[PDB]
């Protein structure tokens, strides 16, 4: 019940209570073990526990499948510092160590109770008698597939062995399966469900990408008479809410063209708000110095350029639209990590959208020349189309983000451009259409 999981959360993990109620529900669903569970949570949300704590409670050994050996080793070390009885059979062991591990596995009451195996070694010929003994023994209790998204062709990563993991799942049917992905799209979710032969009832536990204390709004650089003036007003307002409070935290401003990023930083500085370019081309010493002066409060706002974190971020303002809605959502995610309300601005532009679309098309053409990962190119084009629709579309911005990422529609009573002032959005899109 609840008491057992709570005890585990404190004795072996150290946490007093679950970070979020959603993962509490997910972990209890896995513990019940009635049906296959698909948990999609961001990194640092504790998704690991959703397969780790149930395994700590599982009657028998849990087989975890991860793409790379290095990730398996990192998880093994994290489990070992907690003194948990974890093992790995990836052939990483020498001869004697492999013999000992096989001897513990083959005998009853296996000492290993969570085994990290790359799919190759699970489907390797030599390991088949061991797996047959495991199933016949009924030792396997959970069949976790970490980074399950690698099975889906439309995902950013592809794993050919995760396809045969579906047949593996078809074997050892008596045990449930837990599929985990850092981020999930409904199409990717469908691919995961189909390829892994999971049971038809699947418990999907997905974090709502919606964030109450985030304000989402979009403006069209053609409509606004002076874009830098709007950027300055936004920066001032977000940075300083009241005279007594004074400037707080720091802002972020993404931009694709570095030549434009330096210009934006210098223009902001000249207007009155200091900014530091932090463009990737800059030398390592200078980039470190900038990242530092931003961590301290000396620098008000930092221009991310291609690449970026701080506890409080007053605002994010994309001078240019992002390549993919996943990228834009991640970039805006660091907005307002603190409780206080923040803001997220997208200065969507037809010319910039055309430029980045052409760049995406050229990249897809190069990929096709490679003759591989065609589904990846299709997914990238689909994501860019989704982002441009998001900027164009009339309606609740949070709702469109939820539609793309597939989580439920959010009830943002406050903190959305459309909901609060639909007439303003109507007028703005009418002006944009007239301009175009």
């Amino acid at each position: 019940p609840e008491r057992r999981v709570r005890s585990t959360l404190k004795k072996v993990f150290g946490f007093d209570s679950f970070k979020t109620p959603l993962q509490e529900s997910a972990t209890m669903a896995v513990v019940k073990g009635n049906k296959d569970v698909f948990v999609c949570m961001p990194t640092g949300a504790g998704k690991s526990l959703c397969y780790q704590l149930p395994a700590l409670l599982a009657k028998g050994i849990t087989i975890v499948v991860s793409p790379l050996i290095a990730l398996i080793q990192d998880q093994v070390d994290h489990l070992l510092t907690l003194k948990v009885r974890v093992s790995s059979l990836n052939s990483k062991l020498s001869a004697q160590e492999r013999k000992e591990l096989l001897a513990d596995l083959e005998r009853e009451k296996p000492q290993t109770k969570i085994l990290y195996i790359t799919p190759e070694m699970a489907a390797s010929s030599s390991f088949q008698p061991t797996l047959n003994s495991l199933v016949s023994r009924h030792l396997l209790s959970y069949l976790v597939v970490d980074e399950a998204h690698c099975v889906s062709q439309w995902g950013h990563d592809f794993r050919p062995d995760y396809l045969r993991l579906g047949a593996l799942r078809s074997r050892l049917g008596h045990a449930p399966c837990v599929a985990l992905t850092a981020t999930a799209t409904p199409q990717v979710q469908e691919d995961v469900f189909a390829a892994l032969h999971l049971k038809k009832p699947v418990a999907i536990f997905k974090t709502p990408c919606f964030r109450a204390n985030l304000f989402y709004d979009v403006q069209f650089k053609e409509l606004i008479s002076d874009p830098y003036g709007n950027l300055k007003d936004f920066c001032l307002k977000a940075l300083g809410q009241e005279a007594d409070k004074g400037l707080s935290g720091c802002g972020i401003v993404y931009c694709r063209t570095r030549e434009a990023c330096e210009q934006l930083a210098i223009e902001l500085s000249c207007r009155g708000v200091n900014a530091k370019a932090y463009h990737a081309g800059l030398k390592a010493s200078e980039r470190t110095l900038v990242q530092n002066d931003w961590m301290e409060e000396k620098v008000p706002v930092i221009v991310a350029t291609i690449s970026f974190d701080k506890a409080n971020v007053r605002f994010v303002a994309h001078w240019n639209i992002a390549k993919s809605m996943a990228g834009y959502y991640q970039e805006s995610g660091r907005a307002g990590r603190d409780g206080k309300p923040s803001w997220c601005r997208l200065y969507y532009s037809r010319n910039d959208r055309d430029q980045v679309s052409f760049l995406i098309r050229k990249e897809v053409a190069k990929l096709q020349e490679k003759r591989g990962n065609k589904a990846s190119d299709k997914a990238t084009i689909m994501a860019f189309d989704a982002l441009v629709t998001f900027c164009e579309e009339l309606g609740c911005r949070h709702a469109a983000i939820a539609k793309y990422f597939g989580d439920a529609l959010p009830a943002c009573a406050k903190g959305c451009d459309h909901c609060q002032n639909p007439t303003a959005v109507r007028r703005r899109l009418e002006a944009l259409e007239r301009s175009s």
Epitope: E190, A203, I204, A408
Partner: nanobody, 124 residues
């Protein structure tokens, strides 16, 4: 859960037409495919119509000419209109609603498939 309800079942003479309705209640993010199954007395279930995402329609070579399937995703409703009905199609009709994906503002969801109770059609 999702409550599928059939409607429009009627007894039409040979040559006439009648429409069937299949509305999916509950909160559904999307549906993979709604398929109208036809089952007669003393016979194996036979597949009649299928509507998938994007409006793709799959029929039976013989049954294709008579029936037409049309779905609305926003409404979550699929209509199977029967034209030039024949005395052979005297079977009960069901919906499959294969691959139903449901979710809540919290985050909990399900991906099970749900079946409608059924609608009857008799032909002179």
């Amino acid at each position: 859960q999702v409550q599928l309800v059939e409607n429009g079942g009627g007894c039409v003479k040979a040559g006439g037409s009648l429409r069937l309705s299949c509305a999916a209640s509950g909160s559904i993010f999307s549906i993979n495919r709604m398929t109208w199954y036809r089952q007669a007395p003393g016979k194996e279930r036979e597949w009649v119509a299928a509507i998938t995402s994007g409006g793709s329609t799959n029929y039976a070579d013989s049954v294709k000419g008579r029936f037409t399937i049309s779905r609305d995703n926003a409404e979550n409703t699929v209509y199977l209109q029967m034209n030039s009905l024949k005395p052979e199609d005297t079977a009960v009709y069901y919906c499959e609603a294969y691959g139903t994906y449901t979710l809540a503002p919290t985050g909990e969801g399900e991906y099970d498939d749900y079946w409608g109770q059924g609608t009857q059609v008799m032909v002179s």
